[PDB]
Every structure is written in structure tokens, then in C-alpha cells.
């Protein structure tokens, strides 16, 4: 793993707080914009992360937010990642909702699908794919962030499927019932993400609690077609929600589907 020298980092702005604590905007060697997670003590399974971190850094794709390196020779540990000036996709959708053309929404889906096809090809699971875990750069390109980090979280409210922080609304039945994660559970989450994009950042299953969502999706309830989604687009997101995991498409198939819709428009 790339062990970055913390002396080369200059902190510039606070970017808020997440599951591992504070995140800052800064520069590396006075030139390159980076985001820096300062890992709060007790928030992460640190030895496990350090042992496994190289796999994450070796993931390289234009539509993945890069994990550049880490600083682990002191505490707190730092994770250094690609800076994205427009922040998370969820807030971006909500803040600009009167400015998007449908072509732009499809392009966001394409960006994410390309990243996920790459992760699939590396047999690497995201485990918490959602609009809140995608970021947007200064040119409006969407990239997938925080892939694989779910595994290292120490917070029972997040890791328990009945915890109030578990991403129930992005989870297929086999995750909720058996904790069976696979690229097919990432597929399900991607469908929900497509729904978030086309609804311009609405909360999935709003007004339902997490347990009500679980109960009802297990019985067949599915997210309705957003107004801005054509039937072709809805068919794509809906295909992600087959009850049986082996009936769900791969990200390669989804990408082909999305490209077909683009070529038709
Ligand atoms: C990714 C991120 C940023 C962030 C924000 C960026 N960009 C921007 C740009 C702006 N903002 N964020 C907010 C303020 N805006 C004015 C500009 C960026 O480039 N990288 N990271 C800032 C605060 C955060 F809380 C997070 N998310 C996390 O750390 C985590 C997500 C997950 C998911 C699963 C498991 C563990 C974790 S830990």
C-alpha cells in the first residue's frame, strides 16, 4: 500500500463527518487536491483495514473515486482519496433539481455502471452503493466512492440488519435475511441508485420504516417509476430487483442496456 508522508499534506477545509469521523479537503505536495479521512479511534477495525488496504488501492478506474494511499504510522490513521468538488451525488441531485435534462441523468447512471462493471471484473464488492456514496466533480462526472469500506465499520447500528443505520433501503432480500453479499447485492443497490437519480434525490420508500421496507420488499413491493424515467430506463432499474439473485443482470449487461438507450435517443 502507498504509505503517504503526512508531512506532504496540508489541510484546507472541513468537509463534514461520516462513519469514520471527520473528513477534510487538503493538498498533497502543495499542488493536488485531495480528501483526507481522519479515522476516529474506535470507529474502524484498523488492523483488518491495514492488512487488506492494498487491494483497495489497486482499484483504478476513471469512474471510481481513487483511494490514493494511507497514513498509518500514527493515530488517527488517514485515508487519502480523490477530491470531488461538487460533493456527494445525493445532495447534488437535490440542489440542482430544476436544472437537469434527462440525458444528464442517464449519463450519471452510465458513469456509475462503468465503475461497478470494473469492480465486478475485479470480484470486489462495494457493499454500500447509494447516491450518498457517489461523488461529483467540477465537470459533473459522477464517480463511485467508499467501495469496500463498509466491512471495516465498527458501529452495531450500521452493521446489524436491524440497526437504525443499516442501508436497508438499498438491500436485497438475501442480504436482509442471510447477510449474503455478492455482486448481485450490489446490482440491487445500483437499481435503487438509478431510482434516486431519476427521482432527483428522493428517499426510497419514504414514510416506510426500515422494517416495513424489509417486510414489504420481501413480499414483492418495488419502487415506482419516477416521472423522469422512460419505460426503457425503468425496465433497466427494475431488472436489478429480481427476488432471486441469479435472475439479476451483471453490470456488463446493465452497461450494454444503458448504452443501447443512449444510442436510441
Ligand atoms: C466521502 C465523504 C466526504 C467527501 C467529500 C468530498 N467532496 C466534497 C466537496 C464538498 N463537500 N464534499 C461538502 C461541502 N461542499 C461545499 C463541497 C470528497 O471529495 N471526498 N469525500 C466527506 C464527508 C464524508 F462523511 C464522506 N463519507 C465518508 O467519509 C464515508 C462514507 C462511508 C460509506 C461506507 C462506509 C464507511 C464510510 S466513511
From Swiss-Prot:
This is Tyrosine-protein kinase BTK. The modification Phosphoserine is found at residues 211, 230. Changing residue 174 to K: In XLA; severe. Predominantly expressed in B-lymphocytes. Non-receptor tyrosine kinase indispensable for B lymphocyte development, differentiation and signaling. Binding of antigen to the B-cell antigen receptor (BCR) triggers signaling that ultimately leads to B-cell activation. After BCR engagement and activation at the plasma membrane, phosphorylates PLCG2 at several sites, igniting the downstream signaling pathway through calcium mobilization, followed by activation of the protein kinase C (PKC) family members. PLCG2 phosphorylation is performed in close cooperation with the adapter protein B-cell linker protein BLNK. Part of a complex composed of EEIG1, TNFRSF11A/RANK, PLCG2, GAB2, TEC and BTK; complex formation increases in the presence of TNFSF11/RANKL. Binds GTF2I through the PH domain. Interacts with SH3BP5 via the SH3 domain. Interacts with IBTK via its PH domain. Interacts with ARID3A, CAV1, FASLG, PIN1, TLR8 and TLR9. Interacts with MPL/TPOR. Changing residue 37 to E: In XLA; loss of phosphorylation of GTF2I. Changing residue 196 to G: In XLA; moderate; interferes with substrate binding. Changing residue 132 to Q: In XLA; severe; disturbs ATP-binding. The chain holds residues 394 to 657 of 659 of the full protein. A motif (CAV1-binding) lies at residues 188-195. It is linked to X-linked agammaglobulinemia: Humoral immunodeficiency disease which results in developmental defects in the maturation pathway of B-cells. Affected boys have normal levels of pre-B-cells in their bone marrow but virtually no circulating mature B-lymphocytes. This results in a lack of immunoglobulins of all classes and leads to recurrent bacterial infections like otitis, conjunctivitis, dermatitis, sinusitis in the first few years of life, or even some patients present overwhelming sepsis or meningitis, resulting in death in a few hours. Changing residue 201 to E: In XLA; mild; interferes with substrate binding. It comes from Homo sapiens.
